[PDB]
Design a protein around this ligand. Structure first.
Ligand code: SF4
Lengths: 300, 100, 308, 192
């Protein structure tokens, strides 16, 4: 349970990071009074929290097989509590700033609003799918990493997938992620941070340093690789900008015979000729800004 | 014996300003080692030209404001009324809004 | 050949050159002043770096108007400063047309933007130059009327007569509409921040500062700032009290008021956001021009009413 | 110290001595030129994959910037864009390679990744590691500032040697060797 709760905590932290970046880059182009300084403190403090939990800030490399690389320190409670009692007024300010600029609300609400059919045949797994009214989230339909134990109400849009409905849904998703983090901080399990399976790579470090068998397992799983049975697996999760999925085929060897990475930004970018069909260049740039695609995520 | 000095000062000011810019440019140089834009831009340039030439009559009115009595004020008032009638005609037809 | 007339003439020449160097170094120094407000030897280092860099003439362009556009952008609104009197005995130009000359210089200011837009062999730069030129025409149309309010109050075009008519009351308080229209027009013509970079509504438009490298870009970089300081000097000598003060020397008062108005321009840099292009043109055509025409009519009725 | 020169990746560079070891007016003028190039540096942060947010959160038209930050991964389809943007810039020009992706292949030894920026254009300053902190970038700005402060470049294309002189600076790992080896204890990773 503790591994699942830690995974949920770190995933919602990085989802908060991505949602904050998307909302900051969507609100900068109109108001531009304090759009980046107001967002800089939150991203920097969650980067310091990730730096405390894991190694460096952007890429943790902290999810291991059967658990996590290290245990949480004796100061993560203070950092998380100082984070969680300081964000609600930020969310109120963000809602106020997303409601103040009515010029953008009257401008971006009209052009290129697909609904309920173009978001279901072109992919569109992100906030567009829930903005069209299709209540489909992986965390509620096919739960993973113990997301059934967290009570959070998935927010959905109505009708079309507007450029404003997506950012409203991402603000409400920020609120849901904050509630998930609050529930994680409320009752935390005190179990192990790694499973007791022999295929957990790597094994726990203390037993590696002072038990021969754990040294055997660490020696062979680190060097040659964990020998894995010949099967096929598929994990599909709700990513920070859509639905990500890893489909892995193992041939029985220590490497992967096939890795397939289905990324949401590929399907999000594939549908842009279907909505800029008779639009303007500035409309195309606005639509590109309003879409949460990432080009390195497109090209893997 | 003062306006000649002022004209000389104007002359050296202009000459040394262009000379400073020339020496600055050549010191930067020496060291180191079928389409069409629109028609509304032409329309707004033409608005500028016509209203600038009417502003010319206002320019010449502004210097002799006191030496011409109330009759000159009445004539400039009906001139400005014609100018503002043209401007409000331009406003109301829709040829002055941009809408990009 | 030692004669006192030659000494007085050479002293006037010295006055002209010191006022030129002081306005050039004023613009250059408070360029860094604005960059700090957003180390005075950093501009000297920048000038050394810009001098020791090769000017690039594009191979698709011509070597005349590509270099003559920064020439206009620097020198036109540089010699616009020759009009401004800083003292009764420290003036370089006492000619009769003390307002029309600034109108000449502001009219010729659009040539730099247009010539740069053609000189950059780039369609997007040409469209951006069209947008900027349309904006500065749309505000320099009523720049003249904003000046004619004070001209009609003071009678003649001569700035000496202006600052002598400012003896009993400065022109800022009877004509605040003329003051705000002239401030708006000077912001737009000199390309100050709210009426700046009109490429923000189209990605088929680019700036005219692109493909300018080294000295040809530094000419614009110092020309806009010499332009804003001479616009501030025009503003104080017209609407505020030119060289007028109780105790401190008149040139100290002029420098203090000029510094006050470009810290106000720094406040403009800080406070207001950039309006949309259609809103900018609609404002400058529908609100400013009838308001300054009504201001001219009102000050005409006022100056003809109490004429005894 | 010794100096390398390039005169007119396949170019030739050999070891010489600076011409200031021999006109005291030229020595002060070259020092002032190097100082002016030092304290006034305009970067060109190249848009690439994922060192952007490290150059976004650290604090820009091309052809006026004398410094180019190649940050992201150099791919086979993006390398001609890098070369074209490098030849668009005017000399003097300096290159800072951010991250491992620009120093080397950078965790990608695969068919579609060019193994570093050094394969097509020279790089003056390297920053190692997946995403470097902006303080590492600012320290690299110090490093390239002092490197620019010690060069010998021609003042004009009329009189003088027509070859820029790079300085064979002492490496930072040998200079910091005492401070890095003389580290006795560190904070244990079980706390914050
Ligand atoms: S060094 Fe790391 S963060 Fe930077 S571009 Fe490469 S993978 Fe991205």
């Amino acid at each position: 349970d503790r591994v699942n709760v830690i995974r949920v905590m770190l995933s919602e932290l990085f989802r908060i990071n991505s949602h904050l970046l998307y909302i900051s880059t969507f609100i900068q182009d109109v108001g531009a009074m304090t759009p980046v300084f107001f967002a800089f403190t939150d991203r920097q403090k969650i980067y310091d929290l990730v730096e405390a939990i894991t190694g460096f800030r952007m890429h943790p490399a902290w999810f291991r097989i059967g658990g996590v690389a290290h245990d949480l320190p004796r100061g993560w409670d203070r950092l998380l509590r100082e984070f969680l009692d300081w964000m609600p007024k930020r969310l109120a300010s963000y809602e106020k700033a997303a409601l103040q600029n009515t010029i953008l609300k009257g401008r971006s609400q009209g052009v290129a609003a697909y609904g309920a059919k173009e978001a279901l045949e072109w992919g569109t797994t992100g906030a567009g799918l829930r903005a069209t009214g299709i209540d489909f989230d992986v965390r509620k339909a096919r739960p993973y990493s113990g997301y059934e134990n967290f009570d959070f109400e998935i927010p959905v849009g109505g009708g079309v997938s507007d450029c404003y409905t997506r950012v409203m849904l991402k603000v409400e998703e920020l609120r849901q992620s904050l509630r998930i983090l609050e529930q994680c901080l409320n009752n935390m399990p005190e179990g192990p941070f790694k499973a007791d399976h022999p295929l957990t790579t790597p094994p726990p470090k203390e037993r590696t340093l002072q038990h021969i068998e754990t040294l055997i397992t660490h020696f062979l799983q680190v060097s040659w690789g964990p020998v894995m049975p010949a099967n096929e697996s598929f994990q599909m999760i709700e990513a920070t900008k859509g639905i990500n999925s890893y489909y892995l085929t193992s041939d029985g060897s220590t490497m992967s015979y096939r890795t397939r990475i289905r990324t949401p930004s590929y399907a999000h970018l594939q549908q842009i000729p279907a909505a800029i069909r008779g639009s303007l260049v500035s409309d195309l740039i606005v639509y590109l800004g309003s879409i949460d695609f990432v080009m390195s995520d497109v090209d893997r | 014996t003062e306006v000649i000095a002022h004209h000389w000062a104007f002359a050296i000011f202009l000459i040394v300003a262009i000379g400073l810019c020339c020496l600055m440019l050549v010191g930067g140089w020496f060291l180191g080692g079928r389409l069409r834009l629109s028609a509304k831009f032409y329309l707004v340039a033409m608005f500028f030209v016509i209203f600038d030439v009417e502003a010319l009559y206002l320019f010449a009115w502004s210097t002799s404001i006191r030496e011409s009595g109330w009759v000159g004020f009445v004539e400039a008032a009906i001139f400005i009324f014609v100018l503002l009638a043209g401007l409000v005609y331009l406003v109301r037809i829709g040829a002055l809004d941009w809408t990009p | 050949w030692i004669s006192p007339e030659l000494i007085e003439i050479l002293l006037t020449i010295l006055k002209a050159v010191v006022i030129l160097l002081v306005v050039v170094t004023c613009g250059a120094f408070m360029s860094f002043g604005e960059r700090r407000l957003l180390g005075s030897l950093q501009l000297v280092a920048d000038m050394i770096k810009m001098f020791f860099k090769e000017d690039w003439i594009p191979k698709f362009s011509d070597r005349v108007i590509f270099t003559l556009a920064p020439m206009i952008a620097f020198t036109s609104l540089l010699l616009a400063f020759a009009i401004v009197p800083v003292s009764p005995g420290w003036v370089v130009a006492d000619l009769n047309i003390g307002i029309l000359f600034f109108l000449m210089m502001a009219g010729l200011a659009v040539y730099a933007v247009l010539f740069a837009g053609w000189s950059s062999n780039n369609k997007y730069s040409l469209l951006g130059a069209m947008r900027a030129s349309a904006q500065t025409l749309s505000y320099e149309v009523f720049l003249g009327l904003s000046l004619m309010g004070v001209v009609a109050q003071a009678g003649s075009f001569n700035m000496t007569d202006i600052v002598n008519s400012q003896a009993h009351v400065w022109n800022v308080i009877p004509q605040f509409f003329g003051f705000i229209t002239f401030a708006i027009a000077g912001v737009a013509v000199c390309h100050r921040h709210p009426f700046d970079q009109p490429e923000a509504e189209q990605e088929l438009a680019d700036g005219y500062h692109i493909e300018y490298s080294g000295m040809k870009f530094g000419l614009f970089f110092v020309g806009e700032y010499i332009g804003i300081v001479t616009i501030s000097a025009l503003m104080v000598t017209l609407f505020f009290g030119g060289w007028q003060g109780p105790l401190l020397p008149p040139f100290i008062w002029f420098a203090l008021k000029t510094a006050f108005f470009m810290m106000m321009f720094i406040l403009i840099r800080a406070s207001l956001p950039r309006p949309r292009y259609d809103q900018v043109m609609s404002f400058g055509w529908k609100i400013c021009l009838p308001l300054t025409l009504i201001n001219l009519l009102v000050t005409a009725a006022v100056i003809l009413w109490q004429a005894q | 110290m010794d100096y390398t020169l390039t005169r007119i990746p396949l170019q030739k560079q050999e070891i010489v001595t600076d011409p200031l070891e021999q006109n005291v007016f030229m020595g002060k003028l070259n020092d002032m030129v190097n100082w002016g190039r030092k304290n006034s540096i305009w970067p060109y942060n190249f848009g690439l994959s994922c060192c952007y947010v490290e150059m976004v959160t650290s604090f820009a038209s091309p052809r006026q910037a004398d410094l180019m930050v190649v940050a992201g991964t150099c791919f086979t389809k993006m390398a001609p864009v890098i070369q074209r943007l490098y030849d668009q810039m005017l000399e003097p020009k300096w290159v800072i390679s951010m991250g491992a992706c620009a120093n080397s292949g950078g965790m990608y030894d695969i068919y579609s990744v060019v193994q570093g920026v050094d394969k097509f254009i020279p790089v003056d300053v390297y920053i190692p590691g997946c995403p470097p902190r902006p303080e590492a970038y600012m320290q690299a700005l110090m490093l390239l500032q002092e490197s620019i402060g010690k060069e010998r470049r021609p003042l004009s294309w009329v009189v003088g040697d027509q070859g820029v002189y790079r300085a064979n600076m002492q490496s930072e790992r040998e200079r910091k060797r005492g401070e890095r080896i003389a580290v006795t204890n560190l904070r244990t990773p079980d706390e914050i």
